[PDB]
From Swiss-Prot:
GO terms for molecular function: aspartic-type endopeptidase activity. The active site is at residues 35, 199. The chain holds residues 90 to 419 of 419 of the full protein. It comes from the Eukaryota. It catalyses: Hydrolysis of proteins with specificity similar to that of pepsin A, prefers hydrophobic residues at P1 and P1', but does not cleave 14-Ala-|-Leu-15 in the B chain of insulin or Z-Glu-Tyr. Clots milk. Keywords: Aspartyl protease, Disulfide bond, Hydrolase, Protease, Signal, Zymogen. Disulfide bonds join 255-290. Its EC number is 3.4.23.22. This is Endothiapepsin. Belongs to the peptidase A1 family. Residues 17-328 form the Peptidase A1 domain. GO terms for biological process: proteolysis.
């Protein structure tokens, strides 16, 4: 089998991407944030504290004839951005772009943190990291990809995120019309439960490529590109007036600037992030100071190849017996 679904930016800045997901019988369609940095499929629901729901679409398991309460199961998650959610668990039928999993763990939120409430466009998350990170207790549950894998034509999914435009998540096949040149594959460590890999280096604008190992994760659920302080300083030094602001919480730059591109290495291959992808707009409405899309990972503890990086590429998440990651230009 295969599946194919369009993924759409939630706002004009590409702050995140939502993908429609069918849950239950009859189908209840929710718009979920596909997150290769986590491993829980959780949803706003009829069980969510009412004051914590503000415009989201909810899953109502009592209206699904295929929903079954997973007895005694609970979940609770906290994300790198400080947000969190928790609740109970059902199994139900879940379909993405034509691909159906029966008996998928659907984690129903009883509580969500303020940032989730405040974002009316995201109805929940669909985790696509390794199932070892799944938070369900006392019996850990599998991701949608893990459950579908054996049935897929090929044990892969691909992320093709758009810049200020829709893109595509495919399951089970590689669309050879969706990228240019070849796909370069690179080794993955699953030891931390992430799609963790090592970039071979970087360049800033038309500058010379610096060969240096950068270990990090391919994370569709993180907006920005988080890299070592040395790398980030080298980038922003090429932007007149750019500075790191402790009060704002990262590098900012004059909104009048033209940003240079940023290149990262995948083996001997090179992925070029155009400068415009690195502009996240005014720090507050009407400001002429703009927030940068490349930021320091110092104090995160890990480098994160988030949407800023991934949207410059066609990315293969290869879930073969030994997982690997593939990147192509597009």
């Amino acid at each position: 089998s295969t599946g194919s679904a369009t993924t759409t930016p939630i706002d004009s800045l590409d702050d995140a991407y939502i993908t429609p997901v069918q849950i239950g019988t009859p189908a209840q369609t929710l718009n979920l944030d596909f997150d290769t940095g986590s491993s829980d499929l959780w949803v706003f629901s009829s069980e969510t504290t009412a004051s914590e729901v503000d415009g989201q679409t909810i899953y109502t398991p009592s209206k699904s004839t295929t929903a079954k309460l997973l007895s005694g199961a609970t979940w609770s998650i906290s994300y790198g951005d400080g947000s969190s959610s928790s609740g109970d668990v059902y199994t139900d039928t879940v379909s993405v772009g034509g691909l159906t999993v029966t008996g998928q763990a659907v984690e129903s939120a009883k509580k969500v943190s303020s940032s989730f409430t405040e974002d009316s466009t995201i109805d929940g998350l669909l985790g696509l990291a390794f199932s070892t990170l799944n938070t369900v207790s006392p019996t850990q549950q599998k991701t949608f990809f893990d459950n579908a894998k054996a049935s897929l034509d090929s044990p892969v999914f691909t992320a093709d995120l758009g810049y200020h435009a829709p893109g595509t998540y495919n399951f089970g096949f590689i669309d050879t019309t969706a990228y240019t040149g070849s796909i370069t594959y690179t080794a993955v460590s699953t030891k931390q439960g992430f799609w963790e890999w090592t970039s071979t280096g970087y360049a800033v604008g038309s500058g010379t490529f610096k060969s240096t190992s950068i270990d990090g994760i391919a994370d569709t659920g993180t907006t920005l590109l988080y890299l070592p302080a040395t790398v980030v300083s080298a980038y922003w030094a090429q932007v007149s007036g750019a500075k790191s602001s402790s009060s704002v919480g990262g590098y900012v730059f004059p909104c009048s600037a033209t940003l240079p591109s940023f290149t990262f290495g995948v083996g001997s291959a090179r992925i070029v992030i155009p400068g415009d992808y690195i502009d996240f707009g005014p720090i507050s409405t009407g400001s002429s100071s703009c927030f940068g899309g490349i930021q320091s990972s110092a104090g995160i503890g890990i480098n994160i190849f988030g949407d800023v990086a991934l949207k410059a590429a066609f990315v293969v998440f290869n879930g073969a017996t030994t997982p690997t990651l593939g990147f192509a230009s597009k």
